[PDB]
């Protein structure tokens, strides 16, 4: 096969053809030493025979059978530890994956985006039994001219391994680098919970880098108290093929730094198991305490942001289902299915409005407009996970990088944080600033906080009702959050009017309005729903970034929304009849 | 101007046209804040007043004048701290440099190779008066279309600066990376040695990256006990541009790691200054102690290598100045001036021979041949810096990476180490192995060491005289080692026969034989001497690698030999008259 001259950014290619044999670089913790150390003295073998571990490059289905046959245990005691962060899966028994230069197909992505993206990429292959798939050169690490592959099974590595009665565990590690502290913590949690008779098999693509890191971690976990670090490093070289302490002249600049960083990492890991036999205190906490921690971003709040100043007029992006379509249309900000002329039916019976956050004056201005249109209990649906409130009549919020100050907290932890911080601000002199295009404060100056109340106190004091859903800014609403919404609609009053809002009244606000709209009008088309919600004043829920520039971190999140809003529409179609007896979370299990 | 579609690997380009003005990104530790921090809160300015520091991008000669005229001190209290590792210089008042992708013109070179390489690169321009010099786009860091530059003077940044009465200090740092621990030590030593009214000006190419790192170090050094780490990081951004704590979304994989590594480095530097206000413990020592040290190779010996087995025959590459030229001559192994038919003038009376190391048996076979051609006392000149000796009749050495086991040691320390290790091995049983092409031991098996002696004891026991020069393997002999040799020849008998040897009989051996040949025969040209010495069985001293692969670390050292051998020649021509009154070191300094 010839080398592809103009390879695409991301190309699906063959990893391993289905062959009956042990996979490349297969090896066991009890194998004999091959070759010699630089001194010519063999390192001790102490503890090697009882580690119950193997490792290899990635494997085709038939190669996995050979492994299961070969290892001295039953599939139920076998755990496949999948270390690849790049997207991969199986066409029948053939292993495949999406390749980008340096095997950085999912470069910079987090696990919560990688696992779902991969599921989708594999899903896009189902429903066909023939596909053009590039070939690959292992030594030159480049893609080669394609060949058609016939198949009738598309599986993730987990589905495939489970179907042979074995276990599975994934880590989405970028090729060429040591794992970050959070992944080490995730791995140690998995390892601490295993049955004492478990057999771990590590693999990545080639079977050397990442896999050697983990074979050394395993060895350290089993024998650090009895064997030295240098002996562990050398014996893993002798039964595998990589010596982690080796920094070759071949490696320069960037590459060289990654080799050094991975070698220092296993040294820190060694020192960790050595000073913490019980693995009680987390690796990340230990590393942090000893200043050898890896870097992670911090999303915690650091500044009171002014969301909107008290003024007497409607809030930004305000709209009702009885509002006129917009004038400032821009098709470049729309997406799949946007017609400039949606049906607009069911809208008058849809008692729903939406807007950006509101201050005290903006809320006064809304009451008359809503009272005149409403025909039942009016609810303000606050969709903000971030801590926010009211300072001297102005809407403020505790802002952290990416507005993710409460990421990871449950609803109750959010409320406790919210009540706590707002209170701690009462009466003090604090900076409350508006943020510019780059999120830096504008002409910040301290100000005395006279009054402080939650948005709920402000809403109820004005005779409206209130319901909080702590949805994270910039992302598709979580499964639990969408269900908390559907549940709420089960028991809500008769002709309840729902006014949705987040920080700007675009992202979360429009996604929920669109979903509510679909629930009440399963006769309208997904395209019409999304189009009307955008024409009214929200954004286009299915919008995607055309040409993703480097600094556009939202790209994958927009894509995730585009995909899930359509999955929601299909949930409404198959479950509204029942009255949604099947919850969205349950339905997702299909 | 326009971008070049295919620039040469290394391309000479313009850094700064000569203009009368402050250089870009010029700033002073006393400047005022511009912009805000993310919290809206400004960091204290404590100590920023008395740092006596400035920074900027690289500058043209006129821009240096603008700086000197601008700072509040006289040229004599001014220190230009040049952080550029890339080769740079001046054509008249215009700054120029040799550019390679990512500005890694000298990627992986040590300061010992760089400073002289740069001097030779700049010298290569001397003589000519016109040069087509590529232009350069700062915003995209790409080589643009060439212009014709006319100059009458070529200078190093050091020569240009001192001519303006200022002081100069260089650190050869690679762009994009934090400084390594040994470079930090070298900086701390420079720093500790300064008068207290010194003005330090830092610059790299753009005035950011490397420069920001040292602006932050400088601040830390002057105010660590009074200002927090976070404040120094923020206030340095307010007067400069770059915020070191910022890891931007646009930085991925390799790039992102570098940003992180530099930010962690200034944090460790901060802890170090905090804990060592007196800067007594070197940074590297402290870093190793705390396990936050940067990685460096270990050249220490670790295995007894079998240099040459006790056999009865002349040693490898044996040869005399009465010998017959080689039959297997290879021109790909020669170089500038290789006549395949060089003179013979002054040879029959040079009284010189050479060869690889030798064991007991090979010395024996050598005596008869020498004692027959020698018309005076025979001296064995052992040119090995590495610790070696004789085990059970076999020539062995204590081999460390690159055979640099005694790197950085003086003659006395080398002999002390040699006696210690050789004696320590007597009686014991251990590995003495021969090495393969990868320097790994071939079939390592322990052996009992019955007898042990130094090469000196072996030589003197056989009635020959012994002299030792500790020359480092693979490189051009040091100025001190060359002078130690000249001095020896001035005190030896006029009929003395010198037999040089190293471990292979090629590198060090031929360079010294060639230098001696030139000293006795100032009449014959370099080419004759070098070819003559190659034909006789040595190697070509001016040999260079044609298409050097990334794994051939020796390329730059061969280049250095080819350059210094010619310089030595010019030393003879100008000093053979008075009998070398001025030493090679003294001359070199000119």
B489 closest CA partner among B447, B518, B530, B450: B518
Token duo for residue A128: 């066909």
Q: Which of A247, A290, A550 is facing B250, going by the closest CB pair?
A: A550
Residue B439 contacts A, CB cutoff 8 Å: yes
How many Cβ atoms from other residues are within 10 Å of residue B267's Cβ? 17
Token duo for residue B445: 């098996």
| Bridge partners (DSSP) listed for residue A399 | A303
B177 closest CA partner among B281, B260, B111: B260
Residue A395, SS3 per DSSP = strand
Distance CA B128, CA A356 (A): 70
With contact defined as beta carbons under 8 Å apart, do A376 and A520 qualify? Answer: no
Residue A62, SS3 per DSSP = helix
Mutation to test the B interface, candidates A40, A42, A103, A253, most B Cβ within 10 Å: A40
Residue A308, SS3 per DSSP = strand
Element (H, E) at B512: helix B507-520
DSSP secondary structure code for residue B355 in this structure: E
DSSP secondary structure code for residue A324 in this structure: P
Cα A172 → chain centroid: 11
Entry resolution in angstroms?
A: 2.3
DSSP secondary structure string for all residues of A199-237: EEEEE-SSSSHHHHHHHHHHHHHHHTTTS-HHHHHHHHH
Q: Which residues of A31-63 are buried (b: 16+ CB within 10 A; e: fewer)?
A: eeeeebbbbbeebeeebbeebbbbbbbbbbbbb
Residue B40 contacts A, CB cutoff 8 Å: yes
With contact defined as beta carbons under 8 Å apart, do A161 and A64 qualify? Answer: yes
In chain A, residues with a C-beta closer than 8 Å to the C-beta of B86 are none
Separate counts of helices (H) and strands (E) for chain A: 16, 22
Contact: A431, B102; criterion CB under 8 Å: no
The label of the residue with tokens 């002073």 reads B28
B386 closest CA partner among B369, B361, B403: B403
HSE-up of residue B91 (Cα within 13 Å, Cβ side): 24
Maximum distance among all Cα pairs of chain A, rounded to whole angstroms: 90
| Bridge partners (DSSP) listed for residue A435 | A441
Distance CA A85, CA A177 (A): 11
Token duo for residue B550: 């990334």
Q: Which residues contact A147 (CB under 8 A, 6 or more apart)?
A: A1, A132, A133, A135
Distance CA A149, CA A126 (A): 13
Side by side, the strands of the sheet bearing B301-308 are B446-448, B429-433, B301-308, B394-400, B388-391, B452-453
Distance CA A537, CA A521 (A): 19
In chain A, residues with a C-beta closer than 8 Å to the C-beta of B551 are 248-250
The label of the residue with tokens 């029942």 reads A578
> Any idea which fold B1-296 has?
3.90.190
Cα A208 → chain centroid: 27
Tell which phi-psi region holds residue A346, choosing left (phi > 0), alpha (psi between -120 and 50) or beta. Answer: left
Token duo for residue B204: 């790299």
DSSP secondary structure code for residue B33 in this structure: P
Distance CA A122, CA A124 (A): 5
How many Cβ atoms from other residues are within 10 Å of residue A352's Cβ? 23
Token duo for residue B337: 């001036």
Distance CA A95, CA A82 (A): 13
Report the relative pairing of strands B94-99 and A497-501 from DSSP bridges.
unpaired
Distance CA A332, CA B461 (A): 93
How many residues does this entry show for chain B? 590
With contact defined as beta carbons under 8 Å apart, do B565 and B541 qualify? Answer: yes
* Closest-approach residue (CA) in chain B for A431: B40
Report the relative pairing of strands A319-320 and A352-355 from DSSP bridges.
antiparallel
How many residues does this entry show for chain A? 590
Token duo for residue A58: 């990635």
Q: Work out the angle between the directed axes of helices B229-239 and B209-223 (0-180°, nearest 10).
A: 130
Cα B377 → chain centroid: 37
**Closest chain A C-alpha to B218 CA, distance in angstroms:** 22
The label of the residue with tokens 């050598």 reads B366
Q: Which residues contact B437 (CB under 8 A, 6 or more apart)?
A: none
| Bridge partners (DSSP) listed for residue B144 | B3, B135
**Annotated domain spans of chain A:** 1-296, 297-312+386-454, 313-385+455-590
With contact defined as beta carbons under 8 Å apart, do B338 and B534 qualify? Answer: yes
With contact defined as beta carbons under 8 Å apart, do B119 and B98 qualify? Answer: no
CB burial class (10 A; 0-12, 13-18, 19+) of residue A471? buried
With contact defined as beta carbons under 8 Å apart, do B173 and B151 qualify? Answer: no
Element (H, E) at B69: helix B61-70
Class of domain A297-312+386-454: alpha beta
With contact defined as beta carbons under 8 Å apart, do B205 and B175 qualify? Answer: yes
Contact: A108, B253; criterion CB under 8 Å: yes
Cα B543 → chain centroid: 19
A499 closest CA partner among A360, A350, A392: A350
How many Cβ atoms from other residues are within 10 Å of residue A141's Cβ? 14
With contact defined as beta carbons under 8 Å apart, do B105 and B99 qualify? Answer: yes
| Bridge partners (DSSP) listed for residue B137 | B142
Domains B1-296 and B297-312+386-454 agree in fold = no
Scanning A47-104, the segments in alpha helix (DSSP H) are: 61-70
Distance CA B413, CA B406 (A): 8
With contact defined as beta carbons under 8 Å apart, do B266 and B220 qualify? Answer: yes
CB burial class (10 A; 0-12, 13-18, 19+) of residue A479? middle
With contact defined as beta carbons under 8 Å apart, do A257 and B261 qualify? Answer: yes
Distance CA A510, CA A370 (A): 18
DSSP secondary structure code for residue B75 in this structure: G
Element (H, E) at A13: strand A11-16
The label of the residue with tokens 């010099």 reads B133
**Closest chain A C-alpha to B420 CA, distance in angstroms:** 19
For chain A, what is the radius of gyration of the CA atoms? Answer: 28
Cα separations in angstroms, B581 against B490, B496, B564: 11, 21, 20
Is domain B313-385+455-590 in CATH 3.40.50.170, yes or no?
no
Element (H, E) at B164: none
The label of the residue with tokens 């286009």 reads A540
Residue A36 contacts B, CB cutoff 8 Å: yes
The dihedrals phi and psi of B578, each to the nearest 5 degrees, come to -65, 5
Distance CA A151, CA A147 (A): 13
């Amino acid at each position: 096969p010839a080398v592809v001259k103009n390879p695409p950014k991301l190309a699906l290619k063959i990893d391993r053809a289905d062959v009956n044999q042990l996979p490349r670089n297969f090896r066991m913790g009890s194998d004999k030493y091959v070759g010699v150390t630089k001194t010519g003295i063999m390192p001790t073998r102490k503890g090697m025979d009882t580690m119950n571990v193997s490792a290899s490059s990635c494997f085709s289905e038939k190669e996995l059978e050979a492994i299961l046959k070969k290892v001295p245990v039953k599939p139920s005691q076998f755990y496949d530890v999948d270390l690849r962060g790049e997207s991969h899966g199986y066409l029948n028994g053939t292993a495949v994956s999406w390749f980008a230069n340096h095997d950085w197909g999912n470069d910079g992505r987090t696990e919560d985006i990688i696992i779902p993206l991969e599921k989708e990429q594999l899903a896009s292959l189902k429903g066909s039994t023939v596909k053009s798939i590039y070939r690959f050169d292992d030594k030159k690490n480049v893609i080669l001219s394609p060949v058609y592959v016939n198949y009738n099974k598309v599986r993730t590595e987990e589905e495939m391994v489970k179907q042979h009665g074995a276990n599975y565990f994934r880590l989405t590690l970028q090729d060429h680098f040591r794992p970050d502290d959070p992944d080490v913590d995730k791995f140690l949690e998995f390892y601490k919970s295993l049955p004492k008779d478990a057999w771990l098999h590590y693999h990545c693509y080639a079977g050397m880098g990442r896999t050697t890191i983990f074979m050394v971690m395993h060895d350290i976990l089993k024998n650090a108290k009895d064997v030295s670090f240098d002996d562990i490093i050398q014996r893993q070289k002798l039964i595998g093929i990589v010596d982690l302490s080796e920094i070759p002249d071949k490696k320069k600049n960037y590459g060289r730094k990654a080799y050094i960083e991975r070698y220092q990492f296993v040294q820190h890991f060694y020192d960790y198991v050595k000073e913490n036999p019980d693995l009680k205190t987390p690796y990340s906490v230990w590393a942090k305490k000893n200043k050898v921690n890896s870097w992670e971003p911090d999303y915690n709040g650091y500044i009171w942001r002014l969301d909107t100043k008290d003024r007497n007029q409607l809030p930004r992006n305000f709209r009702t289902m009885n509002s006129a379509f917009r004038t400032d249309v821009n098709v470049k900000k729309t997406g799949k299915g946007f017609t400039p002329t949606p049906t607009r039916k069911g809208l008058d019976t849809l008692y729903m409005s939406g807007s950006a956050e509101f201050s005290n004056g903006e809320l006064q201005a809304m009451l008359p407009v809503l009272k005149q249109q409403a025909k039942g209990p009016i609810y303000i649906m606050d969709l903000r996970q971030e801590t926010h409130g009211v300072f001297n009549g102005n809407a403020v919020s505790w802002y952290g990088l990416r507005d993710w100050g409460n990421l990871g907290k449950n609803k109750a932890e959010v409320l406790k944080d919210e009540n706590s911080r707002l209170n701690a601000a009462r009466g003090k002199s604090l900076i409350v600033a508006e943020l510019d295009k780059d999120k830096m404060p504008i002409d910040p100056k301290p100000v005395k906080i006279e009054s402080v109340m939650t948005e709920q106190q402000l809403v109820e004091k004005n005779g409206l009702h209130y319901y909080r859903i702590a949805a994270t800014d910039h992302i598709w609403p979580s499964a639990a959050n969408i269900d908390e919404f559907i549940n709420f609609t089960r028991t809500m009053p008769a002709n309840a009017w729902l006014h949705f809002h987040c920080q700007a009244g675009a992202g979360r606000t429009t996604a929920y309005m669109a979903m509510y709209d679909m629930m009440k009008n399963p006769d309208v088309s997904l395209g019409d729903i999304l189009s009307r919600q955008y024409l009214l004043g929200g954004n286009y829920v299915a919008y995607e970034i055309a040409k993703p520039k480097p600094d556009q971190w939202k790209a994958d999140y927009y894509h995730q929304k585009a995909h899930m809003i359509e999955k929601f529409y299909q949930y409404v179609q198959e479950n509204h009849a029942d009255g949604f007896k099947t919850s969205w979370s349950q339905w997702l299990a299909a």
